[PDB]
Structure 1
Amino acid sequence: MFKAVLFDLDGVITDTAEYHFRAWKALAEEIGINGVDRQFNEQLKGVSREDSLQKILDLADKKVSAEEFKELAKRKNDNYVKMIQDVSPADVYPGILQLLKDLRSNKIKIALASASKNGPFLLERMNLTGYFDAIADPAEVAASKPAPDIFIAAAHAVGVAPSESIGLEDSQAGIQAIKDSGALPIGVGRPEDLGDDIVIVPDTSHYTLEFLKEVWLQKQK
């Protein structure tokens, strides 16, 4: 049976992917880049602060100085951090709190595999910190999503092999990271964005221990 569930945070645990999108779009427009719309944003979900900024800057022909680059990333984060100050337990996505309780009752490890340095703060805002057996620090891995490092680290942090773990993600980059880690991915979002090669659910209410078991018993190979 699987022995661990590796949780992405933003867009899985709570609608915080929407906040990252709005913050990145605002930053981009401030520097005259209007290409960050929902479609383009799918390429930003799951990627690190610096990687997100560079993907946005790639839309421009000229480059910014190292000094401006650093200021831009900080500017976006300062805005994002203000945006999430009022997040509360009421903001936890449907099914997530129950899933955490069910996993603990069944002795299945719970680890956070978020690329966000604001992850710990958000779990505290939502009164979810106590459910996690481990939080993989995104600053410790040598390579961020789509690299599998963070999921491999989350699994190791709870003493479980990635091959015996399920990863929950809402992004293209994150799903790739799960795939290359050896864990089984179950994405949440629309088929047009995440693919038709893995199991995808339309919303988090589908993330029940019953369903994770249903899917796991159906894994290939």
Structure 2
Amino acid sequence: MIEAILFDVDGTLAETEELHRRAFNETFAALGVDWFWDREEYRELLTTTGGKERIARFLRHQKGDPAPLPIADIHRAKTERFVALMAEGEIALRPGIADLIAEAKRAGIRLAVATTTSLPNVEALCRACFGHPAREIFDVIAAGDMVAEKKPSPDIYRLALRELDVPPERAVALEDSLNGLRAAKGAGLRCIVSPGFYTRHEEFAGADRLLDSFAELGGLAGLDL
């Protein structure tokens, strides 16, 4: 009875944020700056979605070295590093995600990504974790700077839904974070949340289901109601 499923990427398809943190810190070292993001600081910075936006936020207050390149160039270098780290093959899909996507495809349900991450990151994740280019898994990919305002703005979900051509009442989102939940709900979507390391402390008021694992969905019927 669902016609589309819209997936968040980071923390939803896979636990990626520690790898992102590594890519940031390695990039900073390679750039010769003293910046270093520990887990405590990264958990705070994660409330700003988008890598460029997160760098900009850090730069507004930090007292270490000035940026030696434009943010966009720092971000490009960090993206390249993340893509390379992803290809090492150590990241797995979260439990339940592969089974849901296979069931959805058997049922003819269309699939989207709706993410704040840059597009090359989606592609790298799909190559490593699904063994296909992203466009063979997802019918619609809404990512990165495709919209002006990132999650918690619903705009990326509104884009995905327009491209899917499915009304929100007939779709559902899977998310891991409060910013993501808010974005989905603003787009009129029911939203299933399963948190992870960096989001477990958050409160998820209005999530339609709150699960310890996507393996607890119980199939496509678990998306209904």
- Structure 2 length as normaliser, TM-score? 0.79
Deviations 1:38-73 (A, max 9, x none): 464254167112112123223415894583433322
2:216 aligned residue (184, 203, 206) = 206
Identity of matched residues, %: 23
**How far apart in 2 are the matches of 1:96 and 1:146?**
23
Deviations 1:167-221 (A, max 9, x none): 11112322221121111121111675331412321223224425633xx41xxxx
Gaps of 5+ in 2: none
Change in Cα spacing, 1:67 to 1:22, as seen in structure 2 (3 Å) is closer
Residue 216 of structure 2 aligns with an amino acid whose one-letter code is H
The structural deviation recorded for 1:5 is 0.9
Alignment of 1:56-205 (within 5 A): 56-61=58-63, 64=66, 67-87=69-89, 91-116=92-117, 117=119, 118-125=121-128, 126-127=130-131, 129=134, 130-189=136-195, 192-197=200-205, 198=207, 199-205=209-215
Gaps of 5+ in 1: none
Decide which moves more: 92-101 or 118-127.
Answer: 118-127
**How far apart in 2 are the matches of 1:18 and 1:83?**
11
* Residues 42, 193 of structure 1: 8 Å contact kept: no
**C-alpha root-mean-square deviation of aligned residues, in Å?**
2.9
Residue 212 of structure 1 aligns with an amino acid whose one-letter code is G
Decide which moves more: 155-164 or 183-192.
Answer: 183-192
* Residues 181, 204 of structure 2: 8 Å contact kept: no
What corresponds to 1:20 in structure 2? 20
**How far apart in 1 are the matches of 2:112 and 2:179?**
18
**How far apart in 1 are the matches of 2:182 and 2:82?**
25
- Structure 1 length as normaliser, TM-score? 0.80
Deviations 1:84-136 (A, max 9, x none): 11237x82222111101111222322111122222123213322543322212
The structural deviation recorded for 1:77 is 1.9
**How far apart in 2 are the matches of 1:171 and 1:42?**
13
Secondary structure, aligned partner of 2:127: helix
